[PDB]
């Protein structure tokens, strides 16, 4: 047996108000749909809503049942506005007509009406006073006094004008200039803030003042002018309410008000101190010094007044100044007051009994400050006849004593004060002496002139690669990665030089640099096809036709100009290397403004073809070795072309992780094969200690690039598991592997045998492979794009390794171009989250701005809607922003979204996309997937370009995104993502979130934007919800 | 109504004042908000105002109703007044 | 207005001729690179043309980055560093 009476035999009654000039009703017709869906029967008096423009047909069609007046008060739960008074049309008190052992919901004011409690105690009734609701965090939904104060504050401003003689706005008309009206607001409460907002929206000048320091901050946030007095007295009392002031403070405040009473035109006094009457703040001679025609509105006319000249219920013109001293301002707007009061009653009756059908409603005595027991104990005045009105004390009160909460951006500005400028200049000067001593160390260890020349062209190409990668468009970061994997296929240049023999390789050193040429020619064809297939998805169908075949004219002049200069007996290889490197730089530099993107692929093709042609022309092979080289490059290119056009673009990261390993193996194949072919030359050489060291280091770098990428492939495809595999040691093991790798360079020198050298090369390749496996497997499937870009740097620098090793000038320029590209991409992606690189690799907790324990807990409940509310709220909006995540493209749901945007753009809306930098499995993935779905690139904006347009936005669709739209990054310094730059979607009118269930993606255990009053949930799979929205937009607009 | 005589046009001044007074008399007899807020107590929709004919009084009413919070969907038969409506922010 | 007269000049250039003159600029640059390649007497000239082209691109990117409030200290800095003709005198 469940504890309670079911809702079926439990009816409610809505009586008509009998108080003089009362026009409100307790329940709207929208408010008797709920309390029928909950389960009550509803009985309404015959004329209860006629004063607030609520017809009887709306009542009897919404679910009520219209009856008379004597039998509606004998209901199980009587819900009315004011206290039950003496009925004059038939002489009886309304407490006599109530049902015995019933329950009542109205304003009571029990501390001022003991005799009405003596009438109600005889009928053994239960009383819920709406004004005794404690102002706690979980009770914003049922706060009737705040609603009446809001309506009075709006009505006082809209009633000040229509009596004031001239404009509030003020404009420069051609007839002449008029100044705005100046409005003083005394007392910032709820009516004060409502008055300041409704007066600032009409274009007036508001200069409000309040004693509590939070209310002046709310004045300066509303756009007003916070006044000040020259006495520092704490205005607060026991809590958020005010207290009585000293006589000297009142005299100084009246001095301020007499000073600024001769300049303002409207003044609204809302001052009201709990416990006693309102403070007199204006004399009868202070208010007559105003201009002839001023309006003076007093919202404290019931509880005394803020003037010694106020008739508490009428207007009068006292020497040319009108006095609006109405005692019932929400009764003049009875429709809005009835709707808000009905909403408060509905949320109260929902909160006090959350069961499906019990209505149990337990009253306790011991309760925490903020639980439901606090609300039920403070709200109930009379429980079954006895008066229990003075409520007991709560538990340990959390009390909100740090009102000014330490926001996240406050803490970095406080951390910036520890960075005294002597230490700034000292740590600036230490970096440059470190760099210049490193340059001196490179100068001392230089064996010859060619090493110095290669260091100079390395540094210059590194600065060129720094500046050309920051210049690319952020919408093209994934064609950047594909074209750097294409250009990094110039490890075939290192393969051809170490390649010799005939139709088939003769020695093992010549056989390694045919497998290297083979697996390095895969990168070229693969990267250039996937870049070409991505860049023509960005071509809008209204773009002019592009005749790219004309770029066969430079290539035939360049490559064909080499061969004609090779037939004539010249040697142009060191200038062809410069031309190829400049074309590779212009391939990235052209990928910067979206109109030259197809130029910046053809230039890379010309550079790769010129480098290969110059290498083949410099070698001058026999016609049987050229057949081997052409066969190897042709077979590798055929495999690259046939795996570069059968994939989907959403499978692009795996292919990118398949492109680095083919580089990482190739470098290991070209360093080892040069230790073998250059071995009988080390005795008669001074540079012998140079070309060994580099051949060690490249064998390390490729060894980390290969195996790590094979983990990064396997954790993206789904072969491996998405959880970070943690070992027992994990730092002693990796530190020992690194110490062994850097201490194995000591037996590699000081011992010139061939047997001890090839075992050191094999040992450093094995230790680097084990290190890549161990470091990559502890990352986890979420932080895996960083592994794609950091290794994208290493395959850059591996090229520089063989650029110093083969004395080749193209490989250093290309490697400095690629390593800086991968480094800048890893920087951008480790700044887009607030983490560091050691935080990502070594696996720290949270971010750099995370403090200690106990992150904040959520507040409020979540709204949930269906497809019909979502389509009725898409139809109403005019400017829409969609924030997608990886959940949109994992469900293959961007194809209904593109057609949805195409339909809603034709109807005259403004639909745009906001892309966060770390949405997706790759830098710039979601841009290319939206381009594949058909979205034009001019309505796809980044985070930094759209994050200030969210206040001027009617609707935001959050699709498949959790952490990039989380507000805990900007508010909670203890959270897991504190300080992360996020999309500020909560600053708009309305947000619709589409996801499966109320869960989490990776972290941040509950997202606090889901429990805001302007966010509706649209639970379901994204594919079916998005194409159902497509179907509704289609079938409704046709 | 010419270019050099628009500093002294009494009918335009009285039409401007009549438009602002028609807006500020629409409210104080209309018993709901114009703005509409999302508080934690219920969604309240904005008021919807229609303005037949945008001259001086019509555009004054459109400005005074748009700045106050409501949405305006006015109409006029001339082709320039619709562009003045779109510049003021109406429909 | 003057931008409206510039619009008919910006819209009378066919999409073929933009690509044609762009490919013409790049083929002239590549054949000039080949012409500097043929006239090279030794390897030091090729290395110096390489460091010249790279230092030219570095100088291109680094002086668009300077603040437009500091263009005359930029002028003064380049006049101070151009006193390295003493290197050629020593
Ligand atoms: C030294 C390396 C650090 C350089 C920093 C500035 C040094 C200023 C002092 C110059 C003299 C140095 C000296 O005497 O060294 C003696 C040592 C010992 O050699 P030594 O026995 O010939 O001593 C030199 C003195 N004479 C010739 C008269 C006998 O010199 C060397 O070790 C030379 C081989 C260099 C091997 C690599 C050095 C470090 C490279 C770091 C690269 C960093 C890249 C980033
Ligand atoms: C080790 C020795 C070589 C590298 C030396 C340091 C390179 C520069 C790092 C410092 C820096 O500029 O940081 C700020 C920058 C970020 O600058 P920022 O913080 O001002 O970001 C805004 C960037 N701009 C102004 C361009 C829009 O850090 C990076 O870019 C990090 C990656 C640097 C990768 C360098 C690769 C080239 C190496 C050539 C050899
Ligand atoms: C040695 C390595 C050389 C580069 C290797 C490139 C691998 C393949 C790249 C992608 C396929 C492109 C095939 C061409 C194509 O479709 O063109 C139409 C496309 C039109 O775009 P599209 O999007 O219609 O591409 C169609 C492609 N399919 C059929 C597969 C769907 O245009 C281009 O690709 C760019 C303009 C033409 C090519 C000019 C680039 C510069 C020269 C490159 C060749 C190298 C030098 C040759 C010198 C000759 C004289 C001596
Ligand atoms: C295509 C990629 C490069 C191919 C390199 C071929 C290397 C080779 O065998 O060179 C032999 C030779 C090396 O030339 P050579 O200068 O040693 O001798 C040529 C013959 N005489 C003595 C008459 C000048 O390469 C060629 O002949 C190049 C042929 C293509 C250029 C001619 C056609 C355009 C004019
Ligand atoms: C033909 C040469 C290869 C193609 C051009 C490569 C290139 O630098 O593109 C121009 C690039 C295009 O990119 P960009 O620098 O104009 O634009 C990207 C950078 N932002 C957007 C920040 C301005 O421009 C330059 O680099 C201008 C410098 C001169 C380039 C030519 C140097 C020739 C040296 C010859 C030495 C002999
Ligand atoms: C033979 C050729 C190869 C040898 C030469 C290799 C040269 C390598 C040059 C690149 C190294 C760059 C190091 C400095 C990075 C920028 C400094 C910085 O602020 O970082 C903080 C940030 C993270 O800290 P952060 O986010 O707190 O700092 C950002 C600054 N605020 C907060 C003010 C915005 O680091 C990164 O984002 C990582 C970027 C660098 C990635 C490097 C990849 C590997 C490169 C080394 C390869 C070595 C091979 C041997
Ligand atoms: C002596 C040999 C010198 C070799 C120089 C090679 C590099 C020059 C060409 C590439 C750099 C300029 C460039 O990008 O121009 C394209 C651009 C194409 O413009 P666009 O319309 O494509 O715009 C996008 C490109 N940006 C923004 C970088 C301009 O055309 C020009 O800049 C026009 C003027 C070119 C002046 C140089 C002509 C070629 C060099 C002739 C050398 C002597 C023979
Ligand atoms: C042996 C002698 C070799 C001489 C080679 C000379 C090459 C000149 C052609 C390149 C011009 C610049 C690239 C094209 C361009 O963007 O022009 C418009 C540019 C302006 O660029 P823009 O405004 O069109 O592009 C936007 C740029 N931002 C966003 C930064 C404003 O014109 C110039 O910069 C004028 C000066 C030209 C460059 C002067 C030389 C610096 C590089 C020298 C390299 C060789 C040494
Ligand atoms: N992109 C990069 O380069 C890069 C680099 C480093 C790290 N990262 C990581 O990538 C993350 C990206 O974050 P994000 O905001 O894009 O997303 P997210 O935080 O990873 O979570 C995806 C959200 O979409 C929902 N979802 C998943 N599949 C869905 C489907 N089929 N239909 C509907 N909803 C679906 C999930 O919730 P439900 O399951 O409840 O529906 C979840 O709320 C970052 O937080 C970061 O950790 C990215
Ligand atoms: N999260 C929360 O805890 C939370 C949130 C919102 C509101 N609240 C409570 O609701 C209250 C809202 O205020 P209200 O409108 O209900 O109170 P109210 O009706 O008493 O407003 C009267 C206003 O006049 C001010 N005043 C008093 N004496 C004055 C004097 N001599 N001179 C000038 N100004 C004077 C008061 O400070 C107050 O702001 C807050 O004060 C707070 O207690 C709490
Ligand atoms: N400086 C200047 O250029 C300047 C100055 C003052 C006035 N004016 C001109 O004078 C006029 C000012 O308007 P006004 O208010 O003084 O004149 P008005 O009182 O005649 O305006 C009545 C409005 O109703 C419209 N209307 C007429 N019949 C209609 C119908 N059947 N349906 C809908 N709308 C209809 C008219 O187009 C007009 O806009 C405009 O034409 C304006 O261009 C121009
Ligand atoms: C033997 C002394 C040099 C050791 C390093 C080899 C070259 C690596 C690149 C130098 C510039 C960073
Ligand atoms: C404009 C750049 C230099 C052009 C040189 C053309 C060919 C000169 C040949 C000189 C004799 C080898």
UniProtKB/Swiss-Prot annotation, chain B:
Which residues make up the binding site for NAD(+)? 1-3, 56, 76-78
| UniProt-annotated location(s) | Mitochondrion inner membrane
Sites of the modification N6-succinyllysine? 43
Q: From which residue to which does any coiled coil extend?
A: none
Question: What is the name listed in the Swiss-Prot or TrEMBL entry for this protein?
Answer: NAD(P) transhydrogenase, mitochondrial
Q: Which function does this protein serve?
A: The transhydrogenation between NADH and NADP is coupled to respiration and ATP hydrolysis and functions as a proton pump across the membrane. May play a role in reactive oxygen species (ROS) detoxification in the adrenal gland.
How is the quaternary structure described?
Homodimer.
Superkingdom field: Eukaryota
UniProtKB/Swiss-Prot annotation, chain C:
Where does the chain cross the membrane? Answer: 22-40, 48-68, 74-90
* Localization annotation: Mitochondrion inner membrane
Outline the subunit composition. Answer: Homodimer.
Tell me, in a sentence or two, what this protein's role is.
Answer: The transhydrogenation between NADH and NADP is coupled to respiration and ATP hydrolysis and functions as a proton pump across the membrane. May play a role in reactive oxygen species (ROS) detoxification in the adrenal gland.
Which family does the record claim for this protein? In the N-terminal section; belongs to the AlaDH/PNT family.
Q: What is this protein called?
A: NAD(P) transhydrogenase, mitochondrial
Q: What would be the name of the gene that encodes this protein?
A: NNT
**Full-protein interval shown:** 454 to 543 of 1086
């Amino acid at each position: 047996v469940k504890p309670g009476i079911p809702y079926k035999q439990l009816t409610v009654g809505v009586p008509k108000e009998i108080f003089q000039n009362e026009k409100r009703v307790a329940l709207s017709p929208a408010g008797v749909q709920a309390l029928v869906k909950q389960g009550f029967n509803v009985v309404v008096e015959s004329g209860a809503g006629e004063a607030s423009k609520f017809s009887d047909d709306h009542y009897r069609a919404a679910g009520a049942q219209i009856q008379g007046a004597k039998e509606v008060l004998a209901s199980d739960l009587v819900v009315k506005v004011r206290a039950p008074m003496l009925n004059p049309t038939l002489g009886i008190h309304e407490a006599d007509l109530l049902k015995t052992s019933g329950t009542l919901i109205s304003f009571i004011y029990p501390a001022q009406n003991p005799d009405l409690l003596n009438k109600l105690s005889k009928r053994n009734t239960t009383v819920l006073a709406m004004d005794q609701v404690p102002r706690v965090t979980i009770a914003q939904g049922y706060d009737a006094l705040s609603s009446m104060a809001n309506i009075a504050g709006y009505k006082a401003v809209v009633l000040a004008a229509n009596h004031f003689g001239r404009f509030f706005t003020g404009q420069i008309t051609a007839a002449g200039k008029v100044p705005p009206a100046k409005i003083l607001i005394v007392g910032g409460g709820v009516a004060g803030l409502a008055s300041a907002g409704a007066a600032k929206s009409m274009g007036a000048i508001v200069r409000g003042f309040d004693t509590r320091a939070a209310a002046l901050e709310q004045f300066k946030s509303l756009g007003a002018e916070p006044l000040e007095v020259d006495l520092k007295e704490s205005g607060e009392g026991q809590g958020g309410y005010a207290k009585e002031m000293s006589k000297e403070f009142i005299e100084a405040e009246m001095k301020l008000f007499a000073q600024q009473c001769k300049e303002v035109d409207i003044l609204i006094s809302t001052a009201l101190i709990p416990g006693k009457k309102a403070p007199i703040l204006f004399n009868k001679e202070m208010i007559e010094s105003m201009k002839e025609g001023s309006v003076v509105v007093d919202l404290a006319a019931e509880a005394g007044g803020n003037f010694e000249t106020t008739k508490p219920g009428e207007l009068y013109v006292h020497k040319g100044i009108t006095h609006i001293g109405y005692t019932d301002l929400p009764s003049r707007m009875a429709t809005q007051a009835s709707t808000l009061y009905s909403n408060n009653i509905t949320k109260l009756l929902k909160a006090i009994s959350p069961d499906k059908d019990n209505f149990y409603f337990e009253v306790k005595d011991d309760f925490d400050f903020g639980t439901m027991g606090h609300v039920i104990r403070g709200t109930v005045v009379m429980k079954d006849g006895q008066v229990i009105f003075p409520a007991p004390t709560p538990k340990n009160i959390p009390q909100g004593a740090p009102v000014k909460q330490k926001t996240v951006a406050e803490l970095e500005a406080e951390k910036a004060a520890t960075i005294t400028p002597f230490r700034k200049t000292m740590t600036s000067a230490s970096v440059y002496t470190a760099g210049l001593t490193g340059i001196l160390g490179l100068g001392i260890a230089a064996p010859n002139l060619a090493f110095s020349q290669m260091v100079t062209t390395f540094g210059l190409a590194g600065i060129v690669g720094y500046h050309t990668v920051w210049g690319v468009t952020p919408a093209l970061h994934s064609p950047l990665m594909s074209v750097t994997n294409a250009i990094s296929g110039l490890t075939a240049v290192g393969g051809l030089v170490l390649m010799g023999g005939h139709l088939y390789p003769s020695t093992t050193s010549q056989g390694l640099a045919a497998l290297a040429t083979f697996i390095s020619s895969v990168n070229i064809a693969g990267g250039f096809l996937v870049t070409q297939r991505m860049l023509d998805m960005f071509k809008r169908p209204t773009d002019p036709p592009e005749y790219n075949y004309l770029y066969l004219l430079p290539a035939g002049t360049f490559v064909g100009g080499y061969l004609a200069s090779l037939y004539s007996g010249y040697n142009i290889e060191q200038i062809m290397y410069l031309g190829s490197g400049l074309c590779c730089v212009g391939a990235l530099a052209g990928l910067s403004t979206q109109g030259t993107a197809r130029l910046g692929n053809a230039l890379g093709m010309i550079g790769v073809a010129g480098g290969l042609a110059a290498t083949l022309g410099g070698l001058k092979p026999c016609p049987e070795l050229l057949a081997q080289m052409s066969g190897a490059m042709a077979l590798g290119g055929t495999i690259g072309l046939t795996i570069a056009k059968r994939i989907q673009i959403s499978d692009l990261p795996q292919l990118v992780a398949a492109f680095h390993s083919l580089v990482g193996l190739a470098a290991v194949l070209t360093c080892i094969a040069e230790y073998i072919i250059e071995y009988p030359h080390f005795a008669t050489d001074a540079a012998a200690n140079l070309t060994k060291i580099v051949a060690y280091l490249g064998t390390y770098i490729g060894g980390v690039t290969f195996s790590g990428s094979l983990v990064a492939y396997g954790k993206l495809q789904g072969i491996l598991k998405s959880a970070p595999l943690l070992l027992p040691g994990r730092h002693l093991l990796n530190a020992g592997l690194l110490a062994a790798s850097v201490g194995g360079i000591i037996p590699f020198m000081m011992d010139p045998s061939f047997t001890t050298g090839i075992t050191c090369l094999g040992s450093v390749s094995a230790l680097s492979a084990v290190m890549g496996v161990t470091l990559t497997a502890a990352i986890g499937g979420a932080d895996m794009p960083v592994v794609i870009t950091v290794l994208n740097s290493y395959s850059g620098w591996a090229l520089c390794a063989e650029g110093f090793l083969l004395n080749n000038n193209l490989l250093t320029i290309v490697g400095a171009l690629i390593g800086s590209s991968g480094a800048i991409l890893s920087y951008i992606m480790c700044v887009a989250m607030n983490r560091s690189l050691a935080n990502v690799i070594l696996g720290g907790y949270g971010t750099t701005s995370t403090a200690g324990g106990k992150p904040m807990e959520i507040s409020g409940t979540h709204t949930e809607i269906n497809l019909d509310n979502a389509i009725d709220m898409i139809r109403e909006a005019n400017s829409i922003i969609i924030t997608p995540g990886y959940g949109l493209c994992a469900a293959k749901a961007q194809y209904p979204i593109a057609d949805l945007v195409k339909m809603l753009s034709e109807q005259g809306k403004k639909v745009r996309f906001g892309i966060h930098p770390v949405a997706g499995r790759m830098p710039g993935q979601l841009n290319v997937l939206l381009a594949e779905a058909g979205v034009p690139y001019d309505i796809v904006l980044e985070m930094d370009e759209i994050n200030h347009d969210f206040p001027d936005t009617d609707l935001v669709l959050v699709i498949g995104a959790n952490d990039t739209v989380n507000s805990a990054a900007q508010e909670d310094p203890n959270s897991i993502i504190a300080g992360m730059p996020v999309l500020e979607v909560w600053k708009s009118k309305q947000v619709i979130v589409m996801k499966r269930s109320l869960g989490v993606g990776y972290a941040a255990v509950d997202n606090p934007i889901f429990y805001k009053p302007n966010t509706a949930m649209l639970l379901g799979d994204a594919k079916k919800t998005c194409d159902a929205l497509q179907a509704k937009v289609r079938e409704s607009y046709q």
